[PDB]
């Protein structure tokens, strides 16, 4: 790894600078380097890792959707040659590479060292998320297995979160939100998505009374996304 010679603390500092500069590819490289030091990540460091890669893959997903739409239109009328497919495939392969990189960091060795609920759920949610992003572009004989890998990671995270975290915990909420998106957008299970979003929202509502003002703000922000989806889906 090209970050092997940089101090862990310097990598974290530079990831924060890269975030401020909106240099998310750099930020991801710095955070990958930090992970590769082999030590566990703190809460703040896990968040930096996620911000970095979410922004990188977000640009790729947005580009892939633009290109896929153009490609589908080109098949509805004039023949334009292989270029749209080729360039969609180029972006797709790069996106798959980023997802594979994240999944590799989780498997070597973030998840296996994560013993506390907050870290383990966060990483299993991330595993589900990056398999979900792979599923968004999958079409061949492995699509079903990719979908099931996302489902399995989300389900393990859900099982831990329900046993170990209050219903308003932002990690628990974000996980449930994303698993509901998986059901609606990936698994062709809109009813499951709606039911999960509704139960998550109501159970969180009932636990808000235990929270400080700052925690209330964190939890209600994610609850609003559940509500926004329920409005789109019903």
């Amino acid at each position: 790894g090209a970050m092997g010679s940089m101090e862990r603390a310097s990598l974290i500092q530079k990831a924060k600078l890269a975030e401020q500069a909106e240099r998310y590819e750099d930020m991801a490289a710095f955070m990958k380097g930090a992970v590769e030091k082999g030590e566990e990540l703190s809460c703040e460091e896990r968040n930096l890792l996620s911000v970095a890669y979410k922004n990188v893959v977000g640009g790729q997903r947005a580009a892939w959707r633009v290109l896929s739409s153009i490609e589908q239109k080109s098949n509805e009328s004039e023949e334009k040659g292989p270029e749209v497919r080729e360039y969609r495939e180029k972006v797709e392969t790069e996106l798959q590479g980023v997802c594979d990189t994240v999944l590799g960091l989780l498997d070597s060795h973030l998840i296996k060292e994560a013993g506390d609920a907050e870290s383990r759920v966060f990483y299993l949610k991330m595993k589900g998320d990056y398999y979900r992003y792979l599923a968004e572009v999958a079409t061949g004989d492995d699509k079903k297995r990719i979908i099931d890998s996302a489902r399995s990671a989300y389900q393990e995270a859900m099982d831990i979160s329900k046993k170990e975290m209050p219903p308003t915990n932002p990690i628990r909420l974000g996980l449930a939100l994303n698993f509901s998106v998986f059901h609606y957008e990936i698994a062709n299970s809109p009813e499951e998505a709606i039911s999960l979003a509704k139960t998550t929202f109501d159970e969180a509502m009932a636990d808000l009374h235990t929270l400080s003002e700052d925690s209330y703000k964190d939890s209600t922000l994610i609850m609003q996304l559940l509500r926004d989806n329920l409005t789109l889906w019903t």
């Binding site: 979410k54 989806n229 789109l232």
Partner: peptide, 10 residues
Amino acid sequence: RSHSSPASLQ
């Protein structure tokens, strides 16, 4: 599409 979680969670 649908809304998913922000990257940073407390």
